[PDB]
Amino acid sequence: MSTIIFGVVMFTLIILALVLVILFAKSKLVPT
Amino acid sequence: MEHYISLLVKSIFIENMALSFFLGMCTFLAVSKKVKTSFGLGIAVIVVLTISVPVNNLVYNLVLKPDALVEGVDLSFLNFITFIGVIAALVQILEMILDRFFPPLYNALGIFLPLITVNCAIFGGVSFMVQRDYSFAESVVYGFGSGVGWMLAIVALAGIREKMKYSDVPPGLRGLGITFITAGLMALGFMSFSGVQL
Amino acid sequence: LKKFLEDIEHHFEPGGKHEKWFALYEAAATLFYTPGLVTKRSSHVRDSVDLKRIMIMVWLAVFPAMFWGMYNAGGQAIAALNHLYSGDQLAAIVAGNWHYWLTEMLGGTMSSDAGWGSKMLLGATYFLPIYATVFIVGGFWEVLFCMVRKHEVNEGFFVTSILFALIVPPTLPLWQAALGITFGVVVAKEVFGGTGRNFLNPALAGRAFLFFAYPAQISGDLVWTAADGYSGATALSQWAQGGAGALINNATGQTITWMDAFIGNIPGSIGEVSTLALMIGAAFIVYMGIASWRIIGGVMIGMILLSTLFNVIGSDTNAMFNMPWHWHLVLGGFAFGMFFMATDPVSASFTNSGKWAYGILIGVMCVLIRVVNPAYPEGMMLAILFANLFAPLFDHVVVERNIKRRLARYGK
Amino acid sequence: KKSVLAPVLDNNPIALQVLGVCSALAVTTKLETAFVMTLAVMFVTALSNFFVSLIRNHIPNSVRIIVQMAIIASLVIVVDQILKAYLYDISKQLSVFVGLIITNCIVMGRAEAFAMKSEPIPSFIDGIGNGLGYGFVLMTVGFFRELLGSGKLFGLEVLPLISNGGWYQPNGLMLLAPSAFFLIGFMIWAIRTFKPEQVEAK
Amino acid sequence: SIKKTLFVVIALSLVCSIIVSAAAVGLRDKQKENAALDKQSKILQVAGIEAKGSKQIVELFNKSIEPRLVDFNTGDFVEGDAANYDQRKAAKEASESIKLTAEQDKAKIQRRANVGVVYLVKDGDKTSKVILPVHGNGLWSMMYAFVAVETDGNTVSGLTYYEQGETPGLGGEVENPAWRAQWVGKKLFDENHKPAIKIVKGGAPQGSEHGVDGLSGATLTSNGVQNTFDFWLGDMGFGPFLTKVRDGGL
Amino acid sequence: MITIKKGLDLPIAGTPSQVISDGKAIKKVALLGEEYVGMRPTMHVRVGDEVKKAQILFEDKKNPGVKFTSPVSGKVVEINRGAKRVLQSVVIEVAGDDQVTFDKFEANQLASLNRDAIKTQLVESGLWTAFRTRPFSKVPAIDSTSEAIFVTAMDTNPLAAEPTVVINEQSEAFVAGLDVLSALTTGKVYVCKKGTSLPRSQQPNVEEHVFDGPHPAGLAGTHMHFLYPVSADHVAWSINYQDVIAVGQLFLTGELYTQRVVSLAGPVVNKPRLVRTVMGASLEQLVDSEIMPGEVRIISGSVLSGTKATGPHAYLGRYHLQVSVLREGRDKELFGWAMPGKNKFSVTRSFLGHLFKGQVYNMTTTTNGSDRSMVPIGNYEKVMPLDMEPTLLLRDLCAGDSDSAVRLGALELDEEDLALCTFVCPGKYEYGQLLRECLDKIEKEG
């Protein structure tokens, strides 16, 4: 089940990376 | 460069992203009312499509392609979700650069970027590249040729629709109905080329 | 005649028993006699020109091409028939096709020594049924739309019908001609509101329908000569295969010289073969100011520049690279489209500067499709339809420059 | 019940909302691909609306699109895998357009406009209804294109082609892209003839 | 806010990923056999074997057809996993393919894999036919076909174009059964063993060993078919392989 | 000198003889209410009331302070109204010589007069209505000023009177009027004329510009396009030479000057000539015994841009200096559209008439065809000399797209500016009416 575990990890990491990039960008650009 | 010239022309005339494979039709038919509005939107599509297609070629070949990271592990079933994420990411990155470092450029293009966040043309262009198994060099030619054809089509439709202010379309076809007929007639003109016998 | 038209006028006016046929009545009454209407507001005098005369001059301008086309279609058919069959076999072929024995029944002959009368008569049997079918079927759609929208029948269908009939193979089936004209009139013209309100050439849109829907009957080596069982390529196809040396007329065994193509002694579409006949007709309408010489000048500029560029570049594989500009002029439908189809004022650009760009685009596209597109030997219909899409765009560029000048008070 | 049949003619996604056009033009060359695409869109739209409505009260507004597209894409991936396993021949004909269901404006349109502000069961019904209207256009356009371009319906010969000893010559343009635009445009003309309230003002 | 946002995203991603990964992996084996059965059915058809059910196709393909790798340069068999070899993918790799020159590239394919796969149709234990996969560029797209050759290495037993994109009325007639039936009994080579199969424009003579009728109104596609067999019967294709077959191979 | 190439001079028979002669005795005159753009009249007179010369008849609601005064002394006999009670005309029967007098100055001090003093005298005398603004061709507001006042000292209209003959008789008044205009304008005064010599004002801000070429070289719209382009923020005023003479007489004698010299001409006029008349003179009495028998149309102004003088409109217009008479062209011709046309005039070369360069035509009011859609064979570009795209501008007018028309230069145009476009239109469109509807819509939303 290496493919399943690799699929689960990569799917989560790809989304987490995308979310973190947007959150970091929003905090450093959008004025408050 | 007969192979590259044929690919560029075929993607523009016989396999146009708008009039042949019908990508971005919802945006193509609606925002084409005015030439100035369509011209700015077309450039935004060109920029994103010309960069996202080669980038996703690398991501697919480095990770998603079979035996890319670990031998015996195929992550190609993540193509759909990964392409959506990277397309959305690159769009947001472009908004960050243009709205912060090139305010004149953001005014011309950034106003349309939310419309093309999940547009079928950008996702469709990436999908066609992977299916046809293009190389990196062919992806760049396909990406540029696909984007130019989309802007060329929507701007041409916008000029036609402005000219149609003098038309006398029947009420049943007025608006959406006559636009479909107009776009179909534009498809006839674009079928002039299917390749280059250089 | 005049008294009869006046007497029946009240029947088609509102409240009469023939109100629904009012569209037909005005199409007939105004055809014979002028409306006799006076002006109502400023410019109490008017120019003598109207849409009827403009359309009738273009309709008459293609008569020399039409008559030569019937003569050439018969001449090509008769020559090929005597090349293939002879004696009893030729007699059986003549009896088996109604075109052939109708010509012989009306005093003509199918023999190799047939005069110009027999050749033109044989061409007439191929062209008149096509023209009659196109006129009746297209006219029905024109009248039906006008009756439904309660408008008078605008002019321009006479030009559309005759031009469509002259750009088809002589062997075209009648049912396809009815479908082709139906697509051109309804889809390209009538759903937009009729004459003057469309953007696409109606006759070429109808030909494009037949081009893609039924390519077997409008391309190849079996449709351009009206001789049963005869297969023969044309000059554009032959040049694409083997260049200038391949221009041989297999019906007679003689090479196709430049004068043969210029005069019109070649197979092809009915009304396209004679460049000299098209030039005579075009000269009359260009002089009258009906056709735009800016568009015609632009087409020549585009064709000459791109063809010369291909000759300079050269190619050891594609024989179309070495075709000169003057060979491009006399082959295919280039002359017909340039003189009578690129000059359609409604489909073309509305600015003088735009007309130059519009014409150049047609000339460039036509040569490009001929040379670098292997699927199609000709591209004039595709070039004009493609340029109809960008004709408004050329106008937009021109006016934006004009608006910028105005905003600067023209330099004050 | 009325909510199911409302998006068929009164609020058709393609004829009125201008949504889902991309697949309607491309896949309707055959009824088999048009029927499978109808089921796939109906399946994805109904389940995406159902799951989104379940978590509608917890989706952050900053990454709302990301959350919605995570559900929609996952369903489409499952549909793509199933099609390759049981309908490989039809799945090969659909080409990239199976993936393009993610970017179909109908799926995201109904999820945001309806599923975010409605109970899950009505959201499931709304997805089924919009799929029926979307499928109605696909099957109608696919019917004419296949019958006039091939003389076949679902691969069954209805009009005998001349090449097979028949009498009907297939129309080549029906298998080409311009025919799809024309059929939809005339289809809209017919719908708005019997539904005058949908006529756009001049 | 941030804690709630990450918890929802992570929980949603985990549930979606598990369903996606399970579906992709669980169905993977059935997906790859569907691709195989599609091509195996086509090879059975050109070989003249009747098979309708999916199980019938699998059992007949294993019993009657044995795929083998062939080196184009030498014409000798090569040991390898023939049932899983992908010639199209190998043709796009520089390490497993050679770039053709203008003189050699008769079929306009621009590349050729170093080793190809042939299918030996065996009736029991003795080879009866050999299936050669050939491809060449048509007017609109690349056309892929299977040609069945008798053990003499000269006689064609059948032809089948299984992937083409030509116009259905003009060029698509390569799939017409009447046109395919003409290839049965034709000779690929002359008495000098030169490639001699000819696509005759306007109709080949009724009594002809090498002539095949061209497609009506489709000269350009016929040239593509003629160029396809010219290249693949030459020294750059199955030339040396068919030379060894006629010498007493298989 | 500015030379005009694009344009058309109509060779219509019946050209006037450029000799001034006394006209018929005029017994009643009128002021036309529909010839003023955007004018909503408040009537100050009733039927039976006796009015003096230069006495106010009605006032404008939409343009406060502007007074329309009687040109003669007499009695109001009828106040004609049409659909929606629109003021057609107010007719005064001439009886007596009573008048209202104003201040008079010397020719030396005219250029030094205060602007407010000049405006007060012009408004009270009713001569303020001679000015028309550009855009919108309206009477200027009494509190507004213009940096450009254009004097139309030329006339290229068909059958038009030569301004040189009239100005030479009133040279002193013409120069005096120019001096008043020089003080009135905040910028310059543009006297637009041909190459013929005219009396000159000594003021440095009065400039003479020579325009040469065919019609519309003589129109004020053409002059503004080449000398002072107009827009929303650049408004210019125009006035004809005979009104400039009236301005000079007003400030020299203190009395309103209502004399006019109009050309009476056309195919059916027995003796075409210049006749002396009065403002608003009845055209039924002026044209009496001057016309050949048959059904004729009397036109106030030129054939290209004029008012059909029938019924309540049968009076000389405020801004019209000629009277054109034509036959009504009701004849039906068998295949007339297909005839060679030896005696048919056209801007195209589809008729044999253009082969005879010296031919004059007895043009009638016939339309020469039915109404159709526009087919741009390029006639508009041959007669439009301004730096505009005529075909695309006309399509906007037909389509009712006011916003696009403004961007294409509709604000620079008057109805007379599109008269040639209306003339040469194959589809028989009337672009003058379409332009006014677009201009009215623009003002309403402004």
Ligand SMILES: Cc1cc2nc3c(=O)[nH]c(=O)nc-3n(C[C@H](O)[C@H](O)[C@H](O)CO)c2cc1C
């Ligand atoms: C010079 C000229 C050329 C024309 N050419 C064509 C033509 O090529 N095809 C056609 O259908 N109608 C033609 N017409 C007729 C008509 O203008 C055209 O159908 C418009 O598109 C009608 O709106 C022509 C008319 C003129 C005056």
Ligand SMILES: COC1=C(OC)C(=O)C(CC=C(C)C)=C(C)C1=O
């Ligand atoms: C040449 O001008 C034309 C006419 O008469 C002059 C027509 O009658 C008509 C009307 C024809 C029919 C069949 C109602 C057309 C369209 C036309 O172009």
Ligand code: FES
């Ligand atoms: S379905 Fe809306 S853009 Fe594709």
